[PDB]
Amino acid sequence: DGVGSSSGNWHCDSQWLGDRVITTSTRTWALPTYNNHLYKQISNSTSGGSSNDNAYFGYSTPWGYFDFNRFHCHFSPRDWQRLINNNWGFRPKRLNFKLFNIQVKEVTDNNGVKTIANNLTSTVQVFTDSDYQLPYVLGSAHEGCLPPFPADVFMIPQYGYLTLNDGSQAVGRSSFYCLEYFPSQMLRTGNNFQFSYEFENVPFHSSYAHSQSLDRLMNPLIDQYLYYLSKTINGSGQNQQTLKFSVAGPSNMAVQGRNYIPGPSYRQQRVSTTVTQNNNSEFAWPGASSWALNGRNSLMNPGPAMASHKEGEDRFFPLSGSLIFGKQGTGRDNVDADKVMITNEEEIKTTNPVATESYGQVATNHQSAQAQAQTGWVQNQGILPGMVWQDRDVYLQGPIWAKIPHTDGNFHPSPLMGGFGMKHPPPQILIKNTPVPNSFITQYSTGQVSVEIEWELQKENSKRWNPEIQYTSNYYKSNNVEFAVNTEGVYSEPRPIGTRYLTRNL
Amino acid sequence: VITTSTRTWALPTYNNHLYKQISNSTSGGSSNDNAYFGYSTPWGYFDFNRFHCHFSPGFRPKRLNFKLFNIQVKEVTDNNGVKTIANNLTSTVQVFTDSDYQLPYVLGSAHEGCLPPFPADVFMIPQYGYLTLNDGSQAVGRSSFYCLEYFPSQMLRTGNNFQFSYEFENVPFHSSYAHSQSLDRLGRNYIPGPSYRQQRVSTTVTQNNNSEFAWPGASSWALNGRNSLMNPGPAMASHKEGEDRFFPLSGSLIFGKQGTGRDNVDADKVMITNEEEIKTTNPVATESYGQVATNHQSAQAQAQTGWVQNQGILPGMVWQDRDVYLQGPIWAKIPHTDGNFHPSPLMGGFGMKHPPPQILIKNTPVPADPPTAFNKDKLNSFITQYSTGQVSVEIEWELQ
Amino acid sequence: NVPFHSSYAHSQSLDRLMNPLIDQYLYYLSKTINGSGQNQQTLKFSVAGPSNMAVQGRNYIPGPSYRQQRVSTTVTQNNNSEFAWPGASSWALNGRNSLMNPGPAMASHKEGEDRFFPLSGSLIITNEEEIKTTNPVATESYGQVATNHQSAQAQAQTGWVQNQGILPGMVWQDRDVAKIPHTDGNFHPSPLMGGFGMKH
Amino acid sequence: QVQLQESGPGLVKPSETLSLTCTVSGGSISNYYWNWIRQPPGKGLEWIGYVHYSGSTNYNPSLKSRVSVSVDTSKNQFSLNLGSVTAADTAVYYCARQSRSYYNEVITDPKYNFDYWGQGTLVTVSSAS
Amino acid sequence: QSALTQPASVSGSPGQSITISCTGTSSDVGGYDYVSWYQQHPGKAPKLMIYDVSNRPSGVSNRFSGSKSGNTASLTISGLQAEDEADYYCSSYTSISTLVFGGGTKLTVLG
Ligand SMILES: [Ca+2]
């Protein structure tokens, strides 16, 4: 509309209305020029790719994308508390995206010093993939999302994708994508871009912890009319065989007949936080649960949803099984165990098997007069009829949605890193600096982004008499307030925050 | 088909109108697996969940109707050395349904205390109690406590009645037939259902091994460090065709004969069901699911195989559920969870997210004489009392 | 009514869905020891990123597998023994063993080896290699799992998963190109020899 | 109000095992980590080790060979057994409690800051009677 | 492991801030922010003045404070009084998850 008239205002806040929450977030972004406007082939052998399991082939593009998949984008820590303490469930409904107050800069080195000034004729290209024709990279828990603190300015990530490969070489079925082939909108410093999205119907994420365990659902006061086999022998001696039977009742609860059985397991190795207990060998990769695809071994991470540890065993964690976040300022490579925070899904222990334990036992043979009964450990167990399980929890730092791969079939599409699986997730938003001339003007753009999500809530109806567990900040005397900036002005998040505090009956 | 029943019940005041913590250590049990924590309530409850409640010697329930009437409140004293049972007309009886499913649901555990199969019997109403989270005998901070007094309830004197109607949610017709064909006798398009192997036990004691393997040989699933016997387990054929003397160790339901003892009773006092009707589409409980390749053959390597002791779902499986018995349960409550598979309960019958609600009942405590000087303590002195009346339950069934 | 049979080949593989240019914010366990010697235990962590793509956390996992014996078209490569019946994967029903044919949908062979085919796993010899993106190889183990608790006295031990049932978060493709048996329950009724399953 | 009390023989002959028990009153053992500290008279504190109700233990590397720490949840008390004592083991033995952790969010080993302490007991290791 | 190193004694006049230090190796102190300070009156069990390097429990006055630079953590006592004389110990979490104490420091209030 004009160079001297602003194209949009600054909206950040949350409105709590009844069963719904509306969270608006507005950030200031900066977009450079990537690859000097050049689509470029990339593969492992460029960096040497010494492992076959690491072999990849794909392209890096001049475009950039806006990523708001993580939760702390849309929720302040306070708003996250109000959500998790008061609600049994939630899920997104509507999405509203706006891109405005674009500004483009040109970079020049005059004499020995660098110069930057407004380029008022330059444009920015932006488009959304609403037919989902491009490779969808959002659901891989990648970096580059809007900063948790709204006062930080962030650098848009460079888009890219991969396709089929054999070793580092491509194949005849591989694909290539020119984002320029998509109709996009072009924006001058007076233009602004917006669109509205509609989440597809998904189940509420369950932000609650069961108050009953799957094997304790019985009435403790009453016997069962069913019978179990108590004795196979009368006593010590020869030819003592017998069959005795007993009522399943309160005195012995292990053997009662039950209608439902815990969810599936794929065993993880168990690592102790205290380092002395762990074995003195390099078993980090050689001892890890993996799955192989087309000859390549992928680590199983995080894997099926399973409790992190048995009750009263805080030190142990199940290797690749639990999500691990870095603390503020954490180094990229080979950091110490203290430098990172390992989350533990012990909330789901009641209905889900412990990740580091065998699912159970099965008989391996037929007993006979000449053969004793023999059993073996079930290390992994697929779905059986009558299993129940809980999904993995979502965190303030964790992902929100993923795209369900488009396939003939799937089971319980809910993604394994947590969040809402969707066949048509929020579409990707691609952006780039229009090239201004293989010799171009060095140029970058900056502007604002606002995003608005409407969340639906499931209120807590419970009749529990005694008070709940609640997420709370302790009353402490320390140098720095939690979830706030320090003296140098750095914002940090002290610990990962789970969603499961309130309880329900099983 | 519409079934109707009516019975006469007797409700004793339970555990002195007190809620009381109960636990492993209250009971005194030694074993870790058998540890529990919970509460016992003054409240009783009605359980009609077995078929023979509704039946005399494809289908599925549709509607339900429940009535409670002819309330009679007996007060008991000891006059001299004899006991005197007198009517108390003014006294009340409290009943409510939990239709929001807010309380622990104990009706799905196949408990005793059901309405009796013989319409002229008079039955005792069983006590209501529940379990919550435990660690060993102790309770954790997440454990919950429910005061049933904190629900709105209807109070009934002798002329009052109580009724409500319930609607079953849509469920699939239970199969009450056996396939005439078998899966392999129809390259094949489908494979048999899942398996979790049980040990095999023979009704001829001589056939069995001379060792104590009743527990040491049992199929179990571990949860939070506690082992639980797998019972009855996934739906599988009880035995191969031609061997009826073998049964899966924990794999089948077992009922007691009339007047059967509680502990260590021989095999002729209990009725061991057999599932063999389903052996067409389902694997045998005591058999492996199959065999798989364990290696790559080569000039130097023979082909090696191994046995599949347990198999999860695979695309293209078909299976039959467990059969229902006139003595067996009707429904169970599907636990409230993120996900479940084939929710039909393992002991048989119709799985439901909103099953028939629980119905809770107690005798409103009537205190004895208080002192004439004020005291703040709660009253522990009560008139010995119990009540009786009539229970009628109607179920409309749909047939195929 | 039945779903549209998928008649396409994915241009991506299940494990490569990541953006190759960017790091994850998640961490993994890189080193369990500092160096050679005694009492070297440590825990070191590193960001999962493009440099090492195997260890990244992923939202979805490949479909189920029931392993088939691997057979070469070059008769010199194969063992000098009769393994056609003993070698073959079977499932047992009411005491009667039944060969698994064609079985669950799985990739016929690894990429780069086309001379091998699953024993009973193919329609006869068609190859399923189109689906090797989302499905495991019929001749390969699904993966590994830990078999024990490690400790100061015990090294970590793993074992090979030969068969794996459904897990939440699996995706798979059906076989490339029937009546659904009338039962209490079924899962993914699409038939194993291919085509459209229907209850009528 | 949590109170700890150490009890045990005040005299131990060399090359014999030393035994002490701490009985917690007012509070149960619960999820807490119980520690043993010893102070040789006129010298600094030294940490023996801890025990957890799960039976987990962690010991001082110098003492790791000859020391053991046990817990009894039934009797609400935990114990110390130190074997092959010498005169260097004469000290005042304290039982302490690791401070309560307000968050169950992450998986970590305990970092030692003590919230409560016993009064301590003197234990003399001597050949004479 | 190796003990933490402290000055044997420090003295000051009432009203004057006092700083006690404990030096530790990179793995034990320098490495993590888990250093505690205990004061022990004669014949009493130690009391926890400061935990997690700079934090202090409820029940401890402003006057006590602590800080960490490199391999050395320091305890600062402002406006000290008569009741503030005791033995102060530095505690630290190590690399192998063991606890290590300083040698102890005696604070004398001149007067
Ligand atoms: Ca958690």
PDB file of C-alpha atoms in Angstrom, chain C residues 52-197:
ATOM      1  CA  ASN C  52      25.188 -38.740  11.388  1.00  0.00           C
ATOM      2  CA  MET C  53      21.710 -39.522  10.070  1.00  0.00           C
ATOM      3  CA  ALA C  54      21.318 -43.006  11.490  1.00  0.00           C
ATOM      4  CA  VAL C  55      20.808 -41.911  15.098  1.00  0.00           C
ATOM      5  CA  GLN C  56      18.154 -39.279  14.542  1.00  0.00           C
ATOM      6  CA  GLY C  57      14.826 -39.600  16.281  1.00  0.00           C
ATOM      7  CA  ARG C  58      12.039 -40.489  13.893  1.00  0.00           C
ATOM      8  CA  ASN C  59       8.260 -40.318  14.117  1.00  0.00           C
ATOM      9  CA  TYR C  60       7.515 -43.476  12.140  1.00  0.00           C
ATOM     10  CA  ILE C  61       8.948 -46.943  11.634  1.00  0.00           C
ATOM     11  CA  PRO C  62       8.764 -49.619   8.933  1.00  0.00           C
ATOM     12  CA  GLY C  63       6.047 -52.225   8.779  1.00  0.00           C
ATOM     13  CA  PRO C  64       6.099 -55.749  10.155  1.00  0.00           C
ATOM     14  CA  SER C  65       8.363 -58.533   8.980  1.00  0.00           C
ATOM     15  CA  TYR C  66       8.256 -62.324   9.008  1.00  0.00           C
ATOM     16  CA  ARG C  67      11.597 -63.467   7.676  1.00  0.00           C
ATOM     17  CA  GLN C  68      11.874 -65.576   4.506  1.00  0.00           C
ATOM     18  CA  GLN C  69      14.883 -67.659   3.521  1.00  0.00           C
ATOM     19  CA  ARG C  70      17.053 -66.035   0.857  1.00  0.00           C
ATOM     20  CA  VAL C  71      17.518 -67.910  -2.422  1.00  0.00           C
ATOM     21  CA  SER C  72      19.850 -67.017  -5.291  1.00  0.00           C
ATOM     22  CA  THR C  73      19.112 -67.545  -8.968  1.00  0.00           C
ATOM     23  CA  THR C  74      22.752 -68.649  -9.372  1.00  0.00           C
ATOM     24  CA  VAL C  75      22.656 -72.279  -8.302  1.00  0.00           C
ATOM     25  CA  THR C  76      26.367 -72.265  -7.478  1.00  0.00           C
ATOM     26  CA  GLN C  77      25.832 -69.761  -4.679  1.00  0.00           C
ATOM     27  CA  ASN C  78      23.171 -71.886  -2.960  1.00  0.00           C
ATOM     28  CA  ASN C  79      23.964 -74.656  -0.493  1.00  0.00           C
ATOM     29  CA  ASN C  80      24.253 -78.261  -1.691  1.00  0.00           C
ATOM     30  CA  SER C  81      21.299 -79.575   0.318  1.00  0.00           C
ATOM     31  CA  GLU C  82      17.536 -79.976   0.112  1.00  0.00           C
ATOM     32  CA  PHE C  83      16.052 -77.054   2.035  1.00  0.00           C
ATOM     33  CA  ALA C  84      12.878 -76.393   0.047  1.00  0.00           C
ATOM     34  CA  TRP C  85      10.545 -77.653   2.777  1.00  0.00           C
ATOM     35  CA  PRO C  86      12.626 -77.542   5.979  1.00  0.00           C
ATOM     36  CA  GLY C  87      13.975 -74.086   5.156  1.00  0.00           C
ATOM     37  CA  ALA C  88      10.636 -72.479   4.326  1.00  0.00           C
ATOM     38  CA  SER C  89       8.776 -70.279   6.791  1.00  0.00           C
ATOM     39  CA  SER C  90       5.477 -71.782   7.871  1.00  0.00           C
ATOM     40  CA  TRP C  91       2.566 -71.171  10.191  1.00  0.00           C
ATOM     41  CA  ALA C  92       0.859 -73.964  12.101  1.00  0.00           C
ATOM     42  CA  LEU C  93      -2.902 -74.380  12.422  1.00  0.00           C
ATOM     43  CA  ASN C  94      -4.495 -77.278  14.313  1.00  0.00           C
ATOM     44  CA  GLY C  95      -1.346 -79.367  14.021  1.00  0.00           C
ATOM     45  CA  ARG C  96      -1.154 -78.817  10.257  1.00  0.00           C
ATOM     46  CA  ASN C  97       1.834 -76.779   9.119  1.00  0.00           C
ATOM     47  CA  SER C  98       1.142 -74.379   6.263  1.00  0.00           C
ATOM     48  CA  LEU C  99       3.802 -72.700   4.166  1.00  0.00           C
ATOM     49  CA  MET C 100       3.734 -68.907   4.379  1.00  0.00           C
ATOM     50  CA  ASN C 101       2.851 -67.796   0.871  1.00  0.00           C
ATOM     51  CA  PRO C 102       3.235 -65.096  -0.269  1.00  0.00           C
ATOM     52  CA  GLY C 103       3.161 -63.781   3.280  1.00  0.00           C
ATOM     53  CA  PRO C 104       3.200 -60.194   4.514  1.00  0.00           C
ATOM     54  CA  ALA C 105       4.249 -57.545   2.024  1.00  0.00           C
ATOM     55  CA  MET C 106       8.016 -57.100   2.170  1.00  0.00           C
ATOM     56  CA  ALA C 107      10.775 -55.964  -0.146  1.00  0.00           C
ATOM     57  CA  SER C 108      11.953 -58.890  -2.242  1.00  0.00           C
ATOM     58  CA  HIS C 109      15.655 -58.119  -1.937  1.00  0.00           C
ATOM     59  CA  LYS C 110      18.097 -55.467  -0.863  1.00  0.00           C
ATOM     60  CA  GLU C 111      18.952 -52.740  -3.325  1.00  0.00           C
ATOM     61  CA  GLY C 112      21.990 -53.782  -5.318  1.00  0.00           C
ATOM     62  CA  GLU C 113      21.269 -57.513  -5.053  1.00  0.00           C
ATOM     63  CA  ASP C 114      18.568 -58.504  -7.535  1.00  0.00           C
ATOM     64  CA  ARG C 115      19.726 -62.113  -7.910  1.00  0.00           C
ATOM     65  CA  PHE C 116      18.139 -63.116  -4.594  1.00  0.00           C
ATOM     66  CA  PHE C 117      14.463 -63.763  -3.955  1.00  0.00           C
ATOM     67  CA  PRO C 118      12.526 -64.865  -0.872  1.00  0.00           C
ATOM     68  CA  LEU C 119      11.828 -68.575  -0.827  1.00  0.00           C
ATOM     69  CA  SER C 120       8.044 -68.487  -0.399  1.00  0.00           C
ATOM     70  CA  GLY C 121       7.756 -64.708  -0.437  1.00  0.00           C
ATOM     71  CA  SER C 122       7.159 -63.957  -4.123  1.00  0.00           C
ATOM     72  CA  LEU C 123       4.426 -64.589  -6.646  1.00  0.00           C
ATOM     73  CA  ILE C 124       5.841 -66.818  -9.375  1.00  0.00           C
ATOM     74  CA  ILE C 125       9.359 -64.530 -10.177  1.00  0.00           C
ATOM     75  CA  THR C 126       8.008 -61.062  -9.460  1.00  0.00           C
ATOM     76  CA  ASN C 127      10.016 -58.741  -7.228  1.00  0.00           C
ATOM     77  CA  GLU C 128       8.575 -56.311  -4.683  1.00  0.00           C
ATOM     78  CA  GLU C 129      11.554 -53.916  -4.629  1.00  0.00           C
ATOM     79  CA  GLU C 130       9.204 -50.961  -5.210  1.00  0.00           C
ATOM     80  CA  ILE C 131       8.184 -51.078  -1.536  1.00  0.00           C
ATOM     81  CA  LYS C 132      11.672 -51.290  -0.046  1.00  0.00           C
ATOM     82  CA  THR C 133      11.190 -47.679   1.063  1.00  0.00           C
ATOM     83  CA  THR C 134       8.605 -48.375   3.779  1.00  0.00           C
ATOM     84  CA  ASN C 135       8.948 -52.112   4.218  1.00  0.00           C
ATOM     85  CA  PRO C 136      11.729 -54.358   5.523  1.00  0.00           C
ATOM     86  CA  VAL C 137      13.478 -56.874   3.304  1.00  0.00           C
ATOM     87  CA  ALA C 138      11.847 -60.290   3.463  1.00  0.00           C
ATOM     88  CA  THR C 139      15.239 -61.967   3.860  1.00  0.00           C
ATOM     89  CA  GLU C 140      16.487 -59.637   6.602  1.00  0.00           C
ATOM     90  CA  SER C 141      16.025 -59.291  10.331  1.00  0.00           C
ATOM     91  CA  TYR C 142      13.767 -56.457  11.402  1.00  0.00           C
ATOM     92  CA  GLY C 143      16.514 -55.163  13.670  1.00  0.00           C
ATOM     93  CA  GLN C 144      18.060 -55.698  17.083  1.00  0.00           C
ATOM     94  CA  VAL C 145      16.933 -55.411  20.699  1.00  0.00           C
ATOM     95  CA  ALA C 146      18.870 -55.568  23.946  1.00  0.00           C
ATOM     96  CA  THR C 147      18.785 -58.946  25.667  1.00  0.00           C
ATOM     97  CA  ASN C 148      20.134 -57.997  29.105  1.00  0.00           C
ATOM     98  CA  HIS C 149      20.917 -55.316  31.630  1.00  0.00           C
ATOM     99  CA  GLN C 150      24.453 -54.100  31.202  1.00  0.00           C
ATOM    100  CA  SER C 151      26.445 -53.460  34.340  1.00  0.00           C
ATOM    101  CA  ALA C 152      29.979 -53.160  35.605  1.00  0.00           C
ATOM    102  CA  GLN C 153      30.248 -56.933  35.194  1.00  0.00           C
ATOM    103  CA  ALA C 154      28.085 -57.412  32.087  1.00  0.00           C
ATOM    104  CA  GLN C 155      28.541 -56.207  28.533  1.00  0.00           C
ATOM    105  CA  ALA C 156      25.547 -55.094  26.535  1.00  0.00           C
ATOM    106  CA  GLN C 157      24.044 -57.925  24.519  1.00  0.00           C
ATOM    107  CA  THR C 158      21.665 -57.772  21.582  1.00  0.00           C
ATOM    108  CA  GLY C 159      19.688 -60.261  19.556  1.00  0.00           C
ATOM    109  CA  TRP C 160      18.134 -60.364  16.135  1.00  0.00           C
ATOM    110  CA  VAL C 161      14.411 -59.812  15.733  1.00  0.00           C
ATOM    111  CA  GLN C 162      13.359 -62.370  13.152  1.00  0.00           C
ATOM    112  CA  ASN C 163       9.631 -61.625  13.223  1.00  0.00           C
ATOM    113  CA  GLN C 164       7.941 -58.429  14.371  1.00  0.00           C
ATOM    114  CA  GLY C 165       4.256 -57.699  14.756  1.00  0.00           C
ATOM    115  CA  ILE C 166       2.461 -54.397  14.504  1.00  0.00           C
ATOM    116  CA  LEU C 167       3.748 -51.516  16.602  1.00  0.00           C
ATOM    117  CA  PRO C 168       2.147 -48.080  16.912  1.00  0.00           C
ATOM    118  CA  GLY C 169       3.725 -45.757  14.390  1.00  0.00           C
ATOM    119  CA  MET C 170       4.310 -48.319  11.653  1.00  0.00           C
ATOM    120  CA  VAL C 171       3.593 -47.594   8.016  1.00  0.00           C
ATOM    121  CA  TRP C 172       3.736 -50.118   5.209  1.00  0.00           C
ATOM    122  CA  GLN C 173       2.762 -50.725   1.601  1.00  0.00           C
ATOM    123  CA  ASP C 174       0.602 -53.585   0.444  1.00  0.00           C
ATOM    124  CA  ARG C 175       1.629 -56.008  -2.284  1.00  0.00           C
ATOM    125  CA  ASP C 176       1.625 -54.866  -5.889  1.00  0.00           C
ATOM    126  CA  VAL C 177      -1.007 -56.260  -8.244  1.00  0.00           C
ATOM    127  CA  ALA C 178     -10.614 -61.418  -2.597  1.00  0.00           C
ATOM    128  CA  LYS C 179     -13.231 -61.926   0.115  1.00  0.00           C
ATOM    129  CA  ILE C 180     -12.589 -60.960   3.727  1.00  0.00           C
ATOM    130  CA  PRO C 181     -13.300 -64.048   5.866  1.00  0.00           C
ATOM    131  CA  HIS C 182     -16.289 -63.529   8.124  1.00  0.00           C
ATOM    132  CA  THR C 183     -14.801 -63.267  11.592  1.00  0.00           C
ATOM    133  CA  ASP C 184     -14.938 -61.489  14.921  1.00  0.00           C
ATOM    134  CA  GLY C 185     -11.939 -59.400  13.943  1.00  0.00           C
ATOM    135  CA  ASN C 186      -9.263 -58.801  11.355  1.00  0.00           C
ATOM    136  CA  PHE C 187      -6.467 -56.321  10.800  1.00  0.00           C
ATOM    137  CA  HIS C 188      -5.771 -54.560   7.516  1.00  0.00           C
ATOM    138  CA  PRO C 189      -7.958 -57.003   5.597  1.00  0.00           C
ATOM    139  CA  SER C 190      -6.200 -56.267   2.295  1.00  0.00           C
ATOM    140  CA  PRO C 191      -5.258 -59.733   0.990  1.00  0.00           C
ATOM    141  CA  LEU C 192      -1.693 -60.954   0.880  1.00  0.00           C
ATOM    142  CA  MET C 193      -1.679 -62.179  -2.716  1.00  0.00           C
ATOM    143  CA  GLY C 194      -2.828 -58.687  -3.669  1.00  0.00           C
ATOM    144  CA  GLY C 195      -5.953 -56.890  -4.751  1.00  0.00           C
ATOM    145  CA  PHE C 196      -8.970 -55.581  -2.900  1.00  0.00           C
ATOM    146  CA  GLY C 197     -10.339 -57.356   0.147  1.00  0.00           C
TER     147      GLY C 197
END
